[PDB]
Amino acid sequence: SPTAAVIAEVDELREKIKGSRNSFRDQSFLDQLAQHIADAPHLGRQPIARALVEDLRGYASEPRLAAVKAHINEERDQHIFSLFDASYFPSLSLEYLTYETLPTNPHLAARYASPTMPVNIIASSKGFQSRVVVALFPENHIDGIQRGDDLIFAFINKFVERHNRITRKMIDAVMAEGSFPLLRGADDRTVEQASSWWVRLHEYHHRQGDMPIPEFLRYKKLKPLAGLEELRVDVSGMLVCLNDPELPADEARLAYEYILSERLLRYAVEGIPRPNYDAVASQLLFNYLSEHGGIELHGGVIRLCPELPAVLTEFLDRIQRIEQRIHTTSAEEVQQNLLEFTNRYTDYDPDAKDYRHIPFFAEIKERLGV
Amino acid sequence: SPTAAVIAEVDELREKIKGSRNSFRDQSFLDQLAQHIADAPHLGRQPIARALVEDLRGYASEPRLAAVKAHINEERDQHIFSLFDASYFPSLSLEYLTYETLPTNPHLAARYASPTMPVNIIASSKGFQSRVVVALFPENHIDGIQRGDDLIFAFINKFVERHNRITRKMIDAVMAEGSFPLLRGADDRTVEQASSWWVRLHEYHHRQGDMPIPEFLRYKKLKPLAGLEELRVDVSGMLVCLNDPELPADEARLAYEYILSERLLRYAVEGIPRPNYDAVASQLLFNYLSEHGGIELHGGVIRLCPELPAVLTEFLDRIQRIEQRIHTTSAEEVQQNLLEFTNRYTDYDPDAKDYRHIPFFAEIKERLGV
Ligand SMILES: CC[C@H](C)[C@H](N)C(=O)O
Ligand SMILES: CC[C@H](C)[C@H](N)C(=O)O
Ligand SMILES: [Fe+2]
Ligand SMILES: [Fe+2]
């Protein structure tokens, strides 16, 4: 494979520059990196690689990767290649991948438009092979810039893999039989479709509401708040799938099943020893739905109530009433009221100032090794 | 086995009361539990089970498990049986185990005396089989009480298993050759003895210094501070192994290697996606030692410097100077100075108010799957 020989060159340069992360913005390093890229027999020929060489050589006066991102954002081809510095994707340094796009419902694409690119990774350098790396954001490039129209990638194949390895097992063990009938025995192409719908709705709704991100990003980074924000947009996504009549009914219900099953199960068990931000918000959802009649527990198995759509609407309405007070109070006051809401429905240790997995999911973690 | 039949009866009773934790102190529930225990053909005739039945039947007027704890503390036999509620050991409800005691050095038990019981679990009910449950504390019983002379159990067999599963392959991959010569190929009984020394020195030092626990426990539960407290007592134990000449020199050096390798390696990688309390403090140690001449990184491998004992002393002295100010400043002010120290040497995200694995150990987690 030619792409395979390109990636081998990237992987080899990546190996040499590991341990040089502190000089990734030093111009002496960058000139040598650029020269090594340009002199690479297969990689140096690539248009995206010429864009990076030009960007890197100019960095001392323009610390931006403008040529690379122009190439990527215009989809001049299906290759991504750059120098990355993402604190939460530590595996990424000099990296290369090729992707394939997914079929898109046209109403979805127009009414809920965002710069989202749900894609499958076809081939990639080693950093992109880490299971941690599920997406790629514009500020992950060394320049750290994000503009509102930069493309954001989500790697759907990694979400299909997680759903196969964790969510299916959890559906069988934790849900009442018949709970997610469209997802039962679905093939990868079908989960791929739902997951792509999920990410499209997800990104769109992050930018909606009274405290959208990135505008209010620095108020939504505390663990319970970062998770609550993910949950806000995913419940918004569930409700769109339930209520927007211009979406094909069978595809919309499948996407609904996917978002609900991921949030009620896979995300609810993330993090060892303590829940991560997603798990805290999923356990908030779990306890809120149990207490307000959206789900029932019968012998430790979850029943989805017929009334669940109304209880989801009530839950999103409640988040929105808290966020709406941004117009009459401070962001810091809204934060405390989001924390108070969260802590009513989660296992918050006030001395540690952190969270424990609620007993229902602690036992599932023990029983299934998730 | 008769004990096999006793444990089978406990596991079945545990199964019936799962999902009744909200009732574990309701006398109607306790009366019924007590009757089922007393009627168990094998379990009900055990002396410790006689004791539990008696404590549970009296719980409405005396919410204590005094008879059970008298049996256990007096070591009337090597069986433990009770009703537990420990939020960090969620698998424990009604549980039974038998243990065996370990050889003990006389000087160690006299000079560094504490109610520590380093033991091996021989047989146990299901709750005690979780890898989370590494110890048993007196306040873990449903009465929530701990007294200074109550026995505290550490399950050394689980620390041997963790050493062989994680620490050993980390030593091979991350330490310069010859770093831990006494541990190389050491058998399980040898690691057992080193671990039992670790726990004895550990519990002893928790009770020494200017902010001992449990007196100052509620000030040391924030993630970085709970880790730093575990690290304070383990550095103290390392130094005792190096410095106290009345300890047998072979066993002392072996314990030193065990404590250092555990804190430099196994504890340094704990927690996904973020470091737990132990890992934050271990990363503090790693960066402190790197910056102050106690270890060096050559080829991505850790070299223990000959000067390391002096740098460990400097590190413990530093902690002790921060804690000593409890005599002239508030406990809250000491907390802020312990945090400030920690954050100088770890990857602290001030907007999330949490920690990320430093890149050195993030790469090891990816490489070795730990
Ligand atoms: C695919 C979702 C990713 C990880 C992130 N939650 C986002 O909003 O892009
Ligand atoms: C075995 C040690 C346990 C986990 C705890 N750190 C203690 O000091 O009791
Ligand atoms: Fe998101
Ligand atoms: Fe401890």
Side-chain angles (χ1 to χ4, degrees):
Chain A
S1 178
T3 82
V6 162
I7 290 187
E9 291 172 352
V10 169
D11 277 339
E12 175 176 44
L13 299 190
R14 184 179 171 278
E15 195 88 65
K16 295 158 145 93
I17 69 164
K18 86 171 203 294
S20 317
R21 173 157 316 262
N22 302 308
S23 42
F24 277 10
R25 296 178 188 76
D26 167 50
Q27 197 57 52
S28 181
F29 172 83
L30 284 187
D31 288 343
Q32 305 177 68
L33 182 62
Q35 189 58 56
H36 279 92
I37 292 165
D39 293 331
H42 305 83
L43 171 69
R45 312 217 209 81
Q46 296 275 313
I48 187 134
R50 284 185 254 101
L52 187 65
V53 170
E54 170 185 285
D55 280 341
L56 293 191
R57 284 172 169 164
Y59 209 79
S61 53
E62 183 69 16
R64 299 273 226 91
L65 300 197
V68 161
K69 279 168 165 178
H71 179 116
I72 294 169
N73 295 327
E74 284 162 37
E75 294 174 72
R76 300 194 182 148
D77 57 38
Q78 291 67 58
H79 297 186
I80 299 174
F81 169 65
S82 195
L83 183 64
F84 297 102
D85 180 24
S87 65
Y88 46 75
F89 297 143
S91 60
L92 297 177
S93 49
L94 190 74
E95 311 286 346
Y96 190 105
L97 67 67
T98 66
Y99 66 77
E100 72 175 355
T101 60
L102 290 302
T104 325
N105 175 271
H107 171 69
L108 191 57
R111 172 67 185 75
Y112 305 102
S114 72
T116 289
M117 294 280 285
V119 306
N120 286 330
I121 291 175
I122 292 167
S124 70
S125 53
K126 205 254 190 323
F128 279 122
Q129 290 167 15
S130 172
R131 305 218 289 221
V132 179
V133 183
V134 290
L136 185 72
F137 309 98
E139 69 272 19
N140 296 161
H141 293 265
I142 49 153
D143 70 9
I145 303 305
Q146 69 222 96
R147 299 190 14 99
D149 51 13
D150 287 333
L151 298 181
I152 299 160
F153 297 77
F155 305 127
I156 301 305
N157 58 287
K158 302 201 174 199
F159 285 105
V160 164
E161 191 276 336
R162 285 152 145 79
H163 183 93
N164 289 338
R165 180 164 47 71
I166 295 159
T167 316
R168 290 186 203 254
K169 176 174 172 193
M170 285 181 80
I171 290 164
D172 284 346
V174 175
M175 308 295 300
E177 73 196 348
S179 284
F180 296 113
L182 277 38
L183 278 171
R184 193 122 201 91
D187 60 22
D188 286 3
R189 284 337 101 171
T190 289
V191 177
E192 187 179 79
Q193 175 254 113
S195 184
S196 75
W197 278 45
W198 161 63
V199 314
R200 284 176 177 293
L201 288 170
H202 183 90
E203 290 293 343
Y204 173 82
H205 286 110
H206 268 318
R207 297 176 187 215
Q208 315 305 309
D210 286 316
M211 305 180 60
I213 60 159
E215 180 183 0
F216 288 92
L217 194 43
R218 72 182 169 85
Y219 296 110
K220 287 184 169 179
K221 289 183 101 152
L222 303 160
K223 173 189 292 190
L225 293 196
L228 186 53
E229 174 54 22
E230 297 315 322
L231 181 66
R232 176 185 75 86
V233 299
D234 277 358
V235 172
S236 298
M238 298 171 211
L239 289 173
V240 166
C241 293
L242 283 184
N243 304 324
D244 187 336
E246 291 201 274
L247 297 165
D250 52 352
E251 288 177 55
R253 181 77 185 189
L254 193 297
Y256 175 70
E257 293 199 4
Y258 169 84
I259 305 172
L260 177 56
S261 78
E262 293 279 306
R263 234 58 170 149
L264 203 64
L265 302 170
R266 182 169 81 70
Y267 286 114
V269 292
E270 259 179 13
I272 298 165
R274 297 181 181 276
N276 78 341
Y277 63 99
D278 283 314
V280 169
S282 282
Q283 293 174 12
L284 161 46
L285 184 66
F286 176 89
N287 277 329
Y288 186 102
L289 295 177
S290 300
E291 286 181 43
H292 288 95
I295 70 176
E296 287 162 6
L297 296 296
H298 297 126
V301 152
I302 298 174
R303 182 197 151 194
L304 304 181
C305 299
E307 300 86 351
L308 174 59
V311 182
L312 288 170
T313 297
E314 155 200 329
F315 178 80
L316 181 57
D317 280 353
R318 176 61 173 296
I319 293 164
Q320 289 177 336
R321 287 205 299 277
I322 295 163
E323 291 197 339
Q324 192 284 322
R325 279 195 186 186
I326 198 62
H327 295 138
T328 56
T329 67
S330 60
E332 291 78 9
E333 198 160 356
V334 172
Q335 284 182 315
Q336 289 306 135
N337 296 319
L338 292 169
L339 295 175
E340 170 161 0
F341 181 60
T342 293
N343 296 345
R344 179 162 298 111
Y345 295 103
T346 55
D347 189 4
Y348 180 67
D349 179 349
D351 301 318
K353 295 247 227 303
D354 207 335
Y355 297 80
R356 294 173 294 255
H357 278 294
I358 64 173
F360 180 86
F361 284 107
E363 182 280 327
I364 295 156
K365 275 169 91 42
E366 192 59 63
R367 171 170 36 142
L368 305 180
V370 296
Chain B
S1 180
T3 89
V6 169
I7 286 170
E9 282 169 5
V10 176
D11 277 341
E12 143 165 49
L13 254 187
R14 176 175 183 283
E15 196 58 26
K16 274 135 163 43
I17 68 175
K18 71 134 171 52
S20 301
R21 177 162 310 274
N22 289 355
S23 309
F24 279 6
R25 295 161 183 99
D26 166 76
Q27 197 57 44
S28 177
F29 176 79
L30 287 189
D31 281 352
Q32 294 177 60
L33 180 55
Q35 191 63 53
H36 287 86
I37 297 162
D39 284 334
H42 303 86
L43 165 65
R45 307 306 181 111
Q46 304 311 123
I48 195 172
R50 292 305 183 181
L52 181 56
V53 168
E54 167 187 304
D55 289 329
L56 292 182
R57 271 169 180 167
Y59 206 80
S61 55
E62 182 51 359
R64 297 328 208 251
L65 303 191
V68 158
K69 280 187 186 184
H71 177 117
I72 290 171
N73 290 331
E74 294 169 15
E75 297 172 72
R76 300 197 185 145
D77 54 38
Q78 285 74 71
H79 294 216
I80 295 177
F81 172 59
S82 193
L83 188 68
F84 297 100
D85 180 20
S87 64
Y88 47 79
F89 297 145
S91 63
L92 300 181
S93 51
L94 186 78
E95 310 293 342
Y96 199 105
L97 67 68
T98 64
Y99 70 77
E100 96 194 337
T101 55
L102 276 43
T104 167
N105 169 270
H107 175 66
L108 186 68
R111 172 64 183 73
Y112 302 96
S114 79
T116 295
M117 295 284 290
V119 303
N120 290 324
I121 294 174
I122 297 288
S124 58
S125 56
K126 169 87 199 173
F128 277 124
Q129 288 163 17
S130 161
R131 305 220 284 214
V132 179
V133 186
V134 294
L136 185 68
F137 305 95
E139 67 278 18
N140 295 158
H141 292 264
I142 48 158
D143 69 13
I145 307 302
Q146 99 192 242
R147 305 178 56 160
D149 50 21
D150 282 337
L151 298 188
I152 295 171
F153 297 83
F155 305 129
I156 300 302
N157 60 290
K158 297 190 177 192
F159 284 104
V160 173
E161 187 284 331
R162 285 160 142 82
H163 192 84
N164 291 337
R165 175 160 55 72
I166 288 170
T167 319
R168 286 204 206 246
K169 81 200 266 208
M170 288 182 73
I171 294 162
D172 290 345
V174 176
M175 300 304 306
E177 325 153 57
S179 291
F180 298 117
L182 277 42
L183 280 184
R184 180 138 302 254
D187 56 37
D188 284 2
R189 256 185 263 141
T190 297
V191 172
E192 184 177 85
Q193 162 227 289
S195 191
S196 77
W197 279 44
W198 163 63
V199 305
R200 291 178 169 287
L201 291 173
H202 188 95
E203 295 286 351
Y204 173 83
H205 285 105
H206 271 318
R207 290 171 189 210
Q208 311 300 316
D210 285 316
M211 305 183 54
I213 63 182
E215 180 180 3
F216 287 90
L217 175 49
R218 68 180 158 98
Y219 295 109
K220 294 183 154 172
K221 282 191 29 83
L222 308 173
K223 170 191 280 183
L225 293 192
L228 180 57
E229 169 61 19
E230 300 313 317
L231 180 65
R232 180 187 65 94
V233 306
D234 281 350
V235 174
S236 300
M238 291 177 214
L239 287 177
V240 160
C241 292
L242 291 182
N243 290 342
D244 183 345
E246 286 193 79
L247 297 163
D250 56 342
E251 297 175 61
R253 188 75 187 181
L254 172 72
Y256 171 74
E257 288 196 12
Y258 172 88
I259 303 167
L260 185 53
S261 66
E262 292 278 306
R263 230 76 208 174
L264 225 46
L265 301 171
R266 187 170 72 75
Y267 285 119
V269 291
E270 277 194 344
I272 284 81
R274 287 176 187 275
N276 76 346
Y277 59 103
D278 288 305
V280 172
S282 277
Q283 288 172 23
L284 164 47
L285 180 69
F286 171 90
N287 278 322
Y288 190 94
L289 295 175
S290 309
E291 292 197 24
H292 292 86
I295 69 183
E296 298 169 354
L297 312 185
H298 301 306
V301 304
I302 306 178
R303 193 169 299 291
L304 304 182
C305 297
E307 303 85 350
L308 178 55
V311 183
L312 287 171
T313 298
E314 169 188 275
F315 179 80
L316 182 57
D317 282 349
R318 179 58 173 292
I319 295 167
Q320 292 173 336
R321 290 204 299 276
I322 298 165
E323 286 192 341
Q324 188 287 142
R325 283 202 176 182
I326 192 66
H327 299 128
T328 61
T329 64
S330 64
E332 289 76 7
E333 230 170 323
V334 176
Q335 291 185 304
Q336 292 302 126
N337 287 312
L338 289 170
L339 293 171
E340 190 185 17
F341 179 62
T342 297
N343 292 353
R344 186 177 316 270
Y345 297 100
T346 56
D347 189 356
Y348 178 68
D349 179 346
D351 284 342
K353 302 198 163 223
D354 206 337
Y355 297 82
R356 299 174 293 251
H357 281 294
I358 65 172
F360 182 86
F361 286 108
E363 182 284 323
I364 291 173
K365 292 180 67 56
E366 191 67 55
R367 199 164 103 206
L368 303 180
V370 296

